[PDB]
């Protein structure tokens, strides 16, 4: 074959390599920042808010709609399950977790991720995600199964959501768990929960004035465009 | 590190839980267990509470 054709092929391959590099470059990203010890609520909140804002502006995170659609596709065996129903169920489950963790009760969704809360003073609490400790078992841990209705459909939907969440965290996604928060898995098996300003505001409102978020309702899907 | 890795955070959580249960005033003291033991053992020999 023509030597120039081979040269053009190699040139195209190197062009694709340079496109790979430029594709990584065009995602204008900065390394996530963190601290080493729990000292003040304000400092940790500032770091978490900055991390959440950075991940949001990166636009690489999976919202609740994405997980609802993954569950809807994964549970298909002949009959269609409503996406809005699954989204409502997932929101109800995460709100149950939220209500359970503000009372000092950790919730275990899996051997890897355990949802807990850190309070520094009255009126100052912050949700966290921690791994299973090795020598000091957590105080009053409850399974997720405790806070889920006994109906088979509800339990299957929540189990599928948990499994898909674990897979998404393992592969390297950034999933949203509470409203305006983000769940990430860093190096090794360390998980972190980054809280926006309004999410921390709703946490503080719940802890100071007992203003619980309203129950999720069935919302019809909105057209993503226009 | 994690909230469990330090003495102060775990102590604060434990103290908050204990204070909440104490302020509910629903816990059984040692006197209650002594009286239950006295009642359970009240048919072999009476033991002072």
- Work out the helix count of chain A: 6
Report the β-strand fraction of chain A as a percent range: 5-15%
Oligomer: part of a larger assembly
Query: What general outline of chain A do the C-alpha atoms trace?
Result: globular
Decide which structural class fits the backbone of chain A. alpha+beta
Biggest chain pair interface: A-B, 16 and 13 residues
Helix content of chain A: 40-55%
The largest β sheet of chain A comes out as: 4 strands, mixed
- E-strand count of chain A: 7
**Lateral strand order in the biggest sheet of chain A:** 3-2-1-4
- SSE ordering of chain A: HHHHEEEEHEEEH
- Radius of gyration computed on alpha carbons of chain A: 21 Å
Terminal CA distance of chain A: 51 Å
Organism (chain A): Mycoplasma mobile (strain ATCC 43663 / 163K / NCTC 11711) (Mesomycoplasma mobile)
Protein name (chain A): Expressed protein
PDB class: hydrolase
Keywords: ATPase, Complex, kinase, Ring, hydrolase
Any overview of this molecule?
The first copy, chain A, is α+β, with helices and mostly antiparallel strands and 226 residues long. The first copy, chain A, has 6 helices and 7 strands; from the N terminus they run ααααββββαβββα. Chain A has helices at 3-26, 41-58, 64-74, 83-101, 152-171, 197-209, and strands at 107-108, 114-121, 124-130, 142-143, 174-175, 181-185, 191-195. In chain A, the strands form 2 sheets. Chain A has a 4-stranded mixed β-sheet with strand order 3-2-1-4. A 3-stranded antiparallel β-sheet of chain A has the order 5-6-7. In chain A, β2 (114-121) and β3 (124-130) form a beta hairpin. In chain A, α3 (64-74) packs across α4 (83-101), α3 crosses α5 (152-171) and α4 crosses α5 (152-171). Chain A is globular, with a radius of gyration of 21 Å. The A-B interface holds A 36-38, 104, 116, 118-120, 128, 130-131, 133, 136, 138-140 and B 1-6, 9-10, 12-14, 16-17.
């Amino acid at each position: 074959t023509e030597l120039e054709y081979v040269e053009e092929d190699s040139r195209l391959r190197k062009e694709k390599i340079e496109l790979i590099q430029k594709n990584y470059d065009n995602l204008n990203a900065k390394p996530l920042v963190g601290v080493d010890l729990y000292e003040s609520y304000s400092l940790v909140l500032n770091k978490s808010a900055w991390n959440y804002n950075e991940i949001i502006q990166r636009d690489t995170q999976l919202t609740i709609l994405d997980m609802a659609l993954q569950v809807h596709l994964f549970l298909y065996e002949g009959k269609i399950i409503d996406i809005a129903h699954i989204q409502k169920i997932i929101k109800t489950f995460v709100l149950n977790v939220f209500a359970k963790i503000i009372k000092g009760v950790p919730i275990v969704l899996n051997p890897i991720i355990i949802f807990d809360s850190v309070r520094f003073d009255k009126s100052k609490i912050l949700p966290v995600a921690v791994a299973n400790p090795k020598l000091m078992p957590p105080l009053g841990v409850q399974d997720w199964d405790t806070i889920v209705d006994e109906d088979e459909e509800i339990k299957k939907i929540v189990s599928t959501f948990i499994k898909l969440l674990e897979n998404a965290l393992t592969v390297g996604h950034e999933v949203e768990f509470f409203q305006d928060t983000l769940l990430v898995r860093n190096v090794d098996g360390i998980t972190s929960l980054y809280v926006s300003e309004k999410a921390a505001q709703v946490f503080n409102n719940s802890v100071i004035d007992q203003i619980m978020p309203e129950k999720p309702k069935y919302e019809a899907l909105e057209d993503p465009f226009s």
